[PDB]
Tab-separated table of C-alpha atoms and ligand atoms in Angstrom:
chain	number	residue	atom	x	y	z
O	27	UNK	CA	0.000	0.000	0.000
O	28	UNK	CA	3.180	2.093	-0.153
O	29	UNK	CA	2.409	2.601	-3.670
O	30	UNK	CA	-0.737	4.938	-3.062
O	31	UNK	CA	-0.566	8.419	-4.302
O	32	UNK	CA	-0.149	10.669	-1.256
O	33	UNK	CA	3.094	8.228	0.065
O	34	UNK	CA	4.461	7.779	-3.444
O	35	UNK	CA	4.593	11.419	-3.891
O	36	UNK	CA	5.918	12.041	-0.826
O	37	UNK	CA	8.551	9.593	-1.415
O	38	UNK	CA	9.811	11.348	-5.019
O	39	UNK	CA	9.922	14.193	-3.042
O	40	UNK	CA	12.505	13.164	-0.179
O	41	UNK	CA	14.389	10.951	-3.069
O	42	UNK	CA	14.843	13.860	-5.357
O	43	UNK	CA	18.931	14.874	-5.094
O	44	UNK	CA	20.496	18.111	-4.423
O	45	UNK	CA	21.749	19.454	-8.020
O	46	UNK	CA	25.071	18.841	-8.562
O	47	UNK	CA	27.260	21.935	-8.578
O	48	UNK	CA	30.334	22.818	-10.802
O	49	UNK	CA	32.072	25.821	-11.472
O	50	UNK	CA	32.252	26.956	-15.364
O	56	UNK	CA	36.447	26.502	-25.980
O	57	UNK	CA	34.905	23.215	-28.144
O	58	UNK	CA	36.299	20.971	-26.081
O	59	UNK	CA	36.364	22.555	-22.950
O	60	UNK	CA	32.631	22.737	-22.569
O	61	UNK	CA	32.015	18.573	-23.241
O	62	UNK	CA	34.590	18.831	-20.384
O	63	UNK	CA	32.095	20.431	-17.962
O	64	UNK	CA	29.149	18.727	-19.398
O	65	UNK	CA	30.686	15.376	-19.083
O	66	UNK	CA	31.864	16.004	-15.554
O	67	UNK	CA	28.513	17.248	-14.724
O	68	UNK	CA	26.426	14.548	-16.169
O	69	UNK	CA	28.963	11.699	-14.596
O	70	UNK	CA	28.125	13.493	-11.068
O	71	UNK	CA	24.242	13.194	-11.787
O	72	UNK	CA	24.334	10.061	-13.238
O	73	UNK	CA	25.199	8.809	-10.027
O	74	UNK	CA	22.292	10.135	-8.418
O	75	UNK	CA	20.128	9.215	-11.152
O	76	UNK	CA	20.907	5.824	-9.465
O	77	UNK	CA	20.058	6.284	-5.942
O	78	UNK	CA	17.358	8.147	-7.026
O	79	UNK	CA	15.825	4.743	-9.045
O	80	UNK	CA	16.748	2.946	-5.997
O	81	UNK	CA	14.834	4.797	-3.960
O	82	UNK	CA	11.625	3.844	-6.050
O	83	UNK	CA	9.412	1.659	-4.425
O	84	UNK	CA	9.807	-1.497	-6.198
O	85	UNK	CA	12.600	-0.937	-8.494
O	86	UNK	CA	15.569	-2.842	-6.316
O	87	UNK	CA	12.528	-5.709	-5.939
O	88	UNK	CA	12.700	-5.820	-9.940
O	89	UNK	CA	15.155	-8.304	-11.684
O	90	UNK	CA	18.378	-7.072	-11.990
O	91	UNK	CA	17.894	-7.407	-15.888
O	92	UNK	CA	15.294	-5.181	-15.606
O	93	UNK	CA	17.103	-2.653	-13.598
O	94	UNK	CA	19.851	-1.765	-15.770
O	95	UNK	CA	17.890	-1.949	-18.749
O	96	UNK	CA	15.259	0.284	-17.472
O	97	UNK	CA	18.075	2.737	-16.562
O	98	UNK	CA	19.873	2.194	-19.558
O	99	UNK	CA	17.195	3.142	-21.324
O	100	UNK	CA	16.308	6.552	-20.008
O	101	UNK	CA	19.237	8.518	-18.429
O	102	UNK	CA	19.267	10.780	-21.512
O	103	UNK	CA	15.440	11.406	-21.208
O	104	UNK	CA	15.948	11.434	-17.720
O	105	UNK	CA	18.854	14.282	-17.585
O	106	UNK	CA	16.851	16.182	-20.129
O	107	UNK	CA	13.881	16.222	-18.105
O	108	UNK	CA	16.304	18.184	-15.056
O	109	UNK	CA	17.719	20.289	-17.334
O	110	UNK	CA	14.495	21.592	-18.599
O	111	UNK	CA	12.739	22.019	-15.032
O	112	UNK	CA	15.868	24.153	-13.357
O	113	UNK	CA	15.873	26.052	-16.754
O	114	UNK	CA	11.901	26.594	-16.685
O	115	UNK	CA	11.697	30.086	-15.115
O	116	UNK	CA	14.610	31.474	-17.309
O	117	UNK	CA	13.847	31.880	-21.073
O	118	UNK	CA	16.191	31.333	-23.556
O	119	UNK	CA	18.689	29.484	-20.991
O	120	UNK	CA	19.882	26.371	-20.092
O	121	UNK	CA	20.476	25.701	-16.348
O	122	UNK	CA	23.137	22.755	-16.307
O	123	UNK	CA	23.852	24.158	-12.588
O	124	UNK	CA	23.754	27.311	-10.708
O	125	UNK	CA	27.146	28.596	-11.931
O	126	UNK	CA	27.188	26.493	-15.515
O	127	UNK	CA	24.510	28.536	-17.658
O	128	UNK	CA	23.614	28.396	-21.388
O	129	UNK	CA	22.628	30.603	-23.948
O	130	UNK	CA	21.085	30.018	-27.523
O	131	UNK	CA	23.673	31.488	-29.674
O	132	UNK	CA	26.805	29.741	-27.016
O	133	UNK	CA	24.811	26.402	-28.261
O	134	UNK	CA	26.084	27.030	-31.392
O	135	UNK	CA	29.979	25.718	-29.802
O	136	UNK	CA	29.221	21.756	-30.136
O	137	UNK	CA	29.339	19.834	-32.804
O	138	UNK	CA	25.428	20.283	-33.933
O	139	UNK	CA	24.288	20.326	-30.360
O	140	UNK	CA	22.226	23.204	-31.538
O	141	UNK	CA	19.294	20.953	-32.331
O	142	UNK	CA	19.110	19.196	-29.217
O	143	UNK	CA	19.052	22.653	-27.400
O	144	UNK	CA	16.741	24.448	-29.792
O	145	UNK	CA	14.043	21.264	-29.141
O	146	UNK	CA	14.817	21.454	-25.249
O	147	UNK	CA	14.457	25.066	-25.247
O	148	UNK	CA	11.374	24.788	-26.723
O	149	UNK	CA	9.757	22.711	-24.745
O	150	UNK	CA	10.968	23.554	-22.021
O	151	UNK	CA	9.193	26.897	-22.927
O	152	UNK	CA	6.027	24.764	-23.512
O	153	UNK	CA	6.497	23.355	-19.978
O	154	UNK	CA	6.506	26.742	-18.559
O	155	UNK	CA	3.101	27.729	-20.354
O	156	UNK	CA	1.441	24.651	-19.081
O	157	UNK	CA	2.645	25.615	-15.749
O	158	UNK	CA	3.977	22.399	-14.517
O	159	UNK	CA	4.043	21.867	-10.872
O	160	UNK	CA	6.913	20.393	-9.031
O	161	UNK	CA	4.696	17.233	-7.848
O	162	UNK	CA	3.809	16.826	-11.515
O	163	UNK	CA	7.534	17.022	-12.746
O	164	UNK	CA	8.273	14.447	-9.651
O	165	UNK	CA	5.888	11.619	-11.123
O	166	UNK	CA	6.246	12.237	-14.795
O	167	UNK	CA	10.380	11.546	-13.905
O	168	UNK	CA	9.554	8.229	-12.413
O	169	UNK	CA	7.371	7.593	-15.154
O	170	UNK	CA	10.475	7.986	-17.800
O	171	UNK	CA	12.252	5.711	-15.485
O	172	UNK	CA	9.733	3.245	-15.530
O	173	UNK	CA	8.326	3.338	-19.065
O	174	UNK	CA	10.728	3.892	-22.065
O	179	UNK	CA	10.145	-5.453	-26.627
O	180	UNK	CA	11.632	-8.726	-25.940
O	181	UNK	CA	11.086	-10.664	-22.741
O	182	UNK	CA	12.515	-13.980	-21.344
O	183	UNK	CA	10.533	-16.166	-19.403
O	184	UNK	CA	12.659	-15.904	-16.533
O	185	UNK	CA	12.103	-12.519	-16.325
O	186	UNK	CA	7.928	-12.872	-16.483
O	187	UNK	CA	7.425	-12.030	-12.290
O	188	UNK	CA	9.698	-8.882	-12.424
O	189	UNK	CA	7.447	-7.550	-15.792
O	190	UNK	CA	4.524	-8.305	-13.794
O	191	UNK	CA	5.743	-6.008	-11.168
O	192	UNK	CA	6.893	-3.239	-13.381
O	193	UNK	CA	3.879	-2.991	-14.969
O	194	UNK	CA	2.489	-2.048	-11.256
O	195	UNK	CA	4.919	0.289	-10.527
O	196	UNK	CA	4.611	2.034	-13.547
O	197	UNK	CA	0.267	1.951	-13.221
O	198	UNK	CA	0.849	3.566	-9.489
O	199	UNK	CA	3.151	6.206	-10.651
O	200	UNK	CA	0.530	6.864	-13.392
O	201	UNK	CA	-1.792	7.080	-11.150
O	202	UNK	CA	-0.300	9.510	-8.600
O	203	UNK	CA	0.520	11.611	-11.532
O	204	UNK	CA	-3.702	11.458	-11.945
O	205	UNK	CA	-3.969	12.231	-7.935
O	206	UNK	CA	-1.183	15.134	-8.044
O	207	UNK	CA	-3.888	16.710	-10.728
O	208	UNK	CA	-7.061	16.043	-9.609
O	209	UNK	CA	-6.217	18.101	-6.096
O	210	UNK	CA	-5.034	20.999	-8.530
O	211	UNK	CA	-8.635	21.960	-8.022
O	212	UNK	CA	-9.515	22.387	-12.041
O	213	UNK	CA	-12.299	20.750	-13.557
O	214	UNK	CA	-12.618	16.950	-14.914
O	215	UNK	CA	-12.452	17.482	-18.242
O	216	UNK	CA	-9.648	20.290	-17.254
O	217	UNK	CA	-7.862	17.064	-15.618
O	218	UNK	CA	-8.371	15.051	-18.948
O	219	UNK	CA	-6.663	17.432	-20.892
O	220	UNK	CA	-3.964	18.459	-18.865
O	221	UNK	CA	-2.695	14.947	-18.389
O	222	UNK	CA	-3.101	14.646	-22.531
O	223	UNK	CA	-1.088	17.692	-22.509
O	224	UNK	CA	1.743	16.087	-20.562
O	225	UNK	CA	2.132	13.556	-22.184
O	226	UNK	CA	2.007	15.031	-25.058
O	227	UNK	CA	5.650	16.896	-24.475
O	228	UNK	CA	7.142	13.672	-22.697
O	229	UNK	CA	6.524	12.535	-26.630
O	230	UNK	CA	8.807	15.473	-27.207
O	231	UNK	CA	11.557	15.186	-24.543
O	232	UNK	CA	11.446	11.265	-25.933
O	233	UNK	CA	11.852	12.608	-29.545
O	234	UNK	CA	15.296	14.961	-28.611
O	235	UNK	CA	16.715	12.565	-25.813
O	236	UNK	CA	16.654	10.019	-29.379
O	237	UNK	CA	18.141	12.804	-31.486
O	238	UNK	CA	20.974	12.643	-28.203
O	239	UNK	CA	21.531	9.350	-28.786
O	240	UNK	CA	22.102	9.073	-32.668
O	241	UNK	CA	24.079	12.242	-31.838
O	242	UNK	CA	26.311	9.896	-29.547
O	243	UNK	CA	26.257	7.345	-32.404
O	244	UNK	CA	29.175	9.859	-34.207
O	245	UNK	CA	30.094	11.715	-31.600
O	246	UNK	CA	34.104	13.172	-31.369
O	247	UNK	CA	35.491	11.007	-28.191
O	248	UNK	CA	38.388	12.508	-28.130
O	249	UNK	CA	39.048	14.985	-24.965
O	250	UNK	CA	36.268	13.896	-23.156
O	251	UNK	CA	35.211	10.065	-22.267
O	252	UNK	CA	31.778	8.429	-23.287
O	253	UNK	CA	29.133	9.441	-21.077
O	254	UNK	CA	28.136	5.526	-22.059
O	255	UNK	CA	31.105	3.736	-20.672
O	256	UNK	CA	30.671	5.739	-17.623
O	257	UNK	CA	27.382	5.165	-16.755
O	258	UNK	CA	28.028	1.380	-17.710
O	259	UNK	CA	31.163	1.241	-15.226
O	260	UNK	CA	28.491	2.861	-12.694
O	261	UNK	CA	25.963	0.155	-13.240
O	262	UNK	CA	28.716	-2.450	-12.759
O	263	UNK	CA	29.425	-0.901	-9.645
O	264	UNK	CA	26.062	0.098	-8.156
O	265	UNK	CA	23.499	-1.982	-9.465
O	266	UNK	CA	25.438	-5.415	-9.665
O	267	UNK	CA	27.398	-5.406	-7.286
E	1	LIG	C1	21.121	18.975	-23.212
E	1	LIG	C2	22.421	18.183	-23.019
E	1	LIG	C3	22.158	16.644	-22.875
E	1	LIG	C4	21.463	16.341	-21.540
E	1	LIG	C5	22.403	16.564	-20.390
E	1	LIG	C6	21.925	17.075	-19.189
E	1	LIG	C7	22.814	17.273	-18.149
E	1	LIG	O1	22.350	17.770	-16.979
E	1	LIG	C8	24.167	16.992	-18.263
E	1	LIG	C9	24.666	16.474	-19.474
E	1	LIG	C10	23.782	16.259	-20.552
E	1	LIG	C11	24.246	15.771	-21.840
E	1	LIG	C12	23.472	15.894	-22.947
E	1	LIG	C13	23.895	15.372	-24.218
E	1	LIG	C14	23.258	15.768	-25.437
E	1	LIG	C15	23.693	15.220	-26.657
E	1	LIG	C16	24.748	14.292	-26.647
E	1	LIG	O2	25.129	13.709	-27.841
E	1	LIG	C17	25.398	13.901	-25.466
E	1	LIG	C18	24.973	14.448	-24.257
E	1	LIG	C19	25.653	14.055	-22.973
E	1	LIG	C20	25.596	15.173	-21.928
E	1	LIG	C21	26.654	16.276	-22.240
E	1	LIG	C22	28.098	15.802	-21.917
């Protein structure tokens, strides 16, 4: 019963992690990034461990749920400490984009223009911080093949991921508006998850050429972290 809206949300909210700090030119800048995205990363983990359920799920399913979403998952931050300042990207307090200073990595651009977008379309909708908190787990929990051995830890996913739904239904319905208000706001959000989903894939293709050169893989660091955090 520790799945039930009210305790669920509550529970997001106490897991959610400090943002990572870092003090702030090609190169340089994937630097920063790279640093910054190793350090959140790791919290990204504790943060899915901290889901009710998810350390209960095969260990299959745990890495390949996680595998699947960091980039979604670090977009989704990005965008919601960038919400209240236009035209910016909020990587941490001191690190701080612009449009045009996009423009320095390879192509980036896209991936920035689409974020600051909808992160823009975010900020219209007016999305609440309990509303940011499900829709994250949600990510986690959502974005094929299955083995038989791995049938009871499906089972369970599928759970999680109704619950977290659900709270996300809860967190609106005491925002006071209307029913059919409620209908179309949760259309709405899911309608821009569609579009974080659509850039966080852009990311990856982008990954799938990108210049490791200066900098290390983001990849092969997040699958030395699994090694180390989720196996053993
Ligand atoms: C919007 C940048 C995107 C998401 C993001 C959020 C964050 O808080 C820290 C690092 C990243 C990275 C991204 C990215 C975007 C496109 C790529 O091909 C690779 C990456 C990896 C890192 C930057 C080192």
């Amino acid at each position: 019963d520790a799945l039930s809206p009210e305790q669920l949300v509550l529970t997001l909210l106490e897991a959610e992690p400090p943002h990572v700090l870092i003090s702030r030119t090609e190169a340089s800048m994937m630097m920063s990034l790279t640093k910054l995205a190793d350090k959140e990363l790791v919290h990204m983990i504790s943060w899915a461990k901290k889901i009710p359920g998810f350390v209960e799920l095969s260990l299959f399913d745990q890495v390949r749920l996680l595998e699947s979403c960091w980039m979604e998952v670090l977009m989704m931050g990005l965008m919601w400490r960038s919400i209240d300042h236009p035209g910016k990207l909020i990587f941490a307090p001191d690190l701080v984009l612009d449009r045009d200073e996009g423009k320095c990595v390879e192509g980036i651009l896209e991936i920035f223009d689409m974020l600051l977008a909808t992160t823009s379309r975010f900020r219209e909708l007016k999305l609440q911080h309990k509303e940011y908190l499900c829709v994250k787990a949600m990510i986690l929990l959502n974005s094929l093949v299955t083995a038989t051995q791995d049938a009871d830890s499906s089972r369970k996913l599928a759970h999680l991921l109704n619950a977290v739904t659900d709270a996300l239904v809860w967190v609106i319905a005491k925002s006071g508006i209307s029913s059919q208000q409620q209908s179309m706001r949760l259309a709405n959000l899911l309608m821009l998850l569609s579009h974080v989903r659509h850039a966080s894939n852009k990311g990856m293709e982008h990954l799938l050429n990108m210049k490791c050169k200066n900098v290390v893989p983001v990849y092969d660091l997040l699958l030395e972290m699994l090694n180390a955090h989720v196996l053993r």
